[PDB]
Design a protein around this ligand. Structure first.
Ligand code: HEC
Length: 108
């Protein structure tokens, strides 16, 4: 792809410090500021039930792969203009790789 396997352990700790404030990834986990992310890979953006997404995410209609996810995480608003996800992004590909590596495993 254009994504390379990283540290799942490293990714688990980046999640906890960079995403946990607004998201859950476990199956049966509640939506919080942001939607529960279990089952996110292979889904289109804005389709979790019982969550209120912006018109923008839904319409963007992104199919989520390790690779799209990377571009998103780099600069979210730059990738989906009008998204309400208030995260600046992950500039370093290495942090992104470890985080995606983690996400691919815990959201399965
Ligand atoms: C709160 C300050 C957030 C932080 C920190 C992170 N995210 Fe987030 N995310 C947030 C919201 C409010 C939303 C929905 C935005 C909207 O415009 O409707 C999102 C969305 C996502 C998505 C898309 C989910 C989908 O179902 O399409 C993903 C993949 C996602 N968020 C992941 C994610 C990661 C991995 C984060 C840490 C690096 C992270 N977000 C930070 C709120 C917040």
């Amino acid at each position: 792809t254009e994504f390379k396997a990283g540290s799942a352990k490293k990714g688990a700790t980046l999640f906890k410090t960079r995403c946990l404030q607004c998201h859950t990834v476990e199956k049966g986990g509640p939506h919080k500021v942001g939607p529960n992310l279990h089952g996110i890979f292979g889904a289109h953006s804005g389709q979790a039930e019982g969550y209120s997404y912006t018109d923008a995410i839904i319409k963007k209609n992104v199919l989520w792969d390790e690779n799209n996810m990377s571009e998103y995480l780099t600069n979210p608003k730059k990738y989906i203009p009008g998204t309400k996800m208030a995260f600046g992004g992950l500039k370093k590909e290495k942090d992104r790789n470890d985080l995606i590596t983690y996400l691919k495993k815990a959201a399965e």
